[PDB]
Design a protein around this ligand. Structure first.
Ligand SMILES: [Cl-]
Ligand SMILES: [Cl-]
Ligand SMILES: [Cl-]
Ligand SMILES: [Cl-]
Ligand SMILES: [Cl-]
Length: 233
C-alpha cells in the first residue's frame, strides 16, 4: 500500500533551513513524502524554501511562512553589515537592510561577523551563530514584516499547510524533542545549539495574498527574477 502516501505530493525542502523544521518533527505522521534538497537534486511536486530561491523551481507560491531566524549584531550606524556568503537568505536580508542603514554589505563567515561586530561594525547572522537583536523585530520597525519563506506548487495544497501547522504546534509543545529531531535529521545543527535557539523561530503561516505579493516585491529588490513568480490565492 505505497499509495498510502499521496501520489504527486512529493515535497522538497532544505533540511538545514528552518522552513523545514515543522515537517521534520512530524515526518513519520505525514501522508506525503519529504525530501532534502541539501542532499538530493531533483524536481518535486511541492517546494518549501526561502522566497529568494523560488525562481529556481518555476512553481507558484501558495503560502508564506514568517520565521525569526536571524540576529543583528553590533552598530547599525557604522556603515558596514557583515554577513554570510553571497546568495544566502542572510546576504539578501543584509542587502535589504543596508539600504536603510546606509551600509555596505561584506560577505564573510560567522566568526568574522562576530569579530567585526565586536570591533564596532554590524553583522546579520543566523541565530545559531549568535543571538542578538531580532531581524524580525528590526523589519517591523521599518514596516517590512513579511514572510521570507514560501511554499510553492502548481496549486494550493491544503494538506501540506495543515501538516505544517501541526508541526508548528509540535515544536511549541516539545522544544527538547523537536531540537533532538531537527539536530539528527538536519545534518547541520548540534542538539545543544538547537535547544538554545528553537524557541526564537516562532513559525507562522500566512495565506494572505497581499502579504505574499508584498514579500515578492520586497525580495525582488535583490532577486529580480522573483517578479516572474506567480502567487495563487
Ligand atoms: Cl520571515
Ligand atoms: Cl561570498
Ligand atoms: Cl492567513
Ligand atoms: Cl510561477
Ligand atoms: Cl501573480
Amino acid at each position: 500500500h505505497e499509495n498510502l502516501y499521496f501520489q504527486g505530493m512529493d515535497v522538497g525542502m532544505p533540511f538545514s533551513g528552518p522552513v523545514s523544521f515543522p515537517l521534520l518533527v512530524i515526518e513519520e505522521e505525514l501522508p506525503f513524502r519529504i525530501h532534502n534538497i541539501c542532499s538530493e537534486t531533483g524536481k518535486f511536486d511541492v517546494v518549501l524554501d526561502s522566497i529568494t530561491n523560488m525562481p529556481k523551481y518555476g512553481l507558484k507560491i501558495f503560502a508564506g511562512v514568517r520565521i525569526d531566524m536571524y540576529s543583528i549584531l553590533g552598530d547599525e550606524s557604522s556603515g558596514r553589515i557583515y554577513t554570510l556568503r553571497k546568495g544566502t537568505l542572510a546576504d539578501f536580508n543584509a542587502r535589504i537592510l543596508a539600504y536603510y542603514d546606509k551600509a555596505q554589505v561584506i560577505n564573510a563567515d560567522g566568526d568574522t561577523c562576530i569579530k567585526m561586530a565586536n570591533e564596532g561594525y554590524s553583522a546579520l547572522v543566523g541565530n545559531e551563530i549568535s543571538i542578538g537583536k531580532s531581524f524580525r523585530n528590526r523589519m517591523k520597525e521599518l514596516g517590512l514584516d513579511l514572510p521570507s519563506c514560501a511554499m510553492a506548487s502548481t496549486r494550493r495544497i491544503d494538506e501540506v499547510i495543515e501538516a505544517y501547522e501541526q508541526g508548528i504546534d509540535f515544536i511549541k509543545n516539545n522544544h527538547e524533542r523537536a531540537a533532538e529531531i531537527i539536530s539528527k535529521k538536519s545534518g547541520y545543527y548540534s542538539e545543544e545549539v538547537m535547544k538554545k535557539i528553537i524557541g526564537i523561530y516562532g513559525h507562522e503561516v500566512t495565506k494572505k495574498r497581499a502579504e505574499l505579493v508584498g514579500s515578492r516585491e520586497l525580495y525582488s529588490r535583490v532577486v529580480p527574477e522573483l517578479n516572474d513568480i506567480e502567487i495563487i490565492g
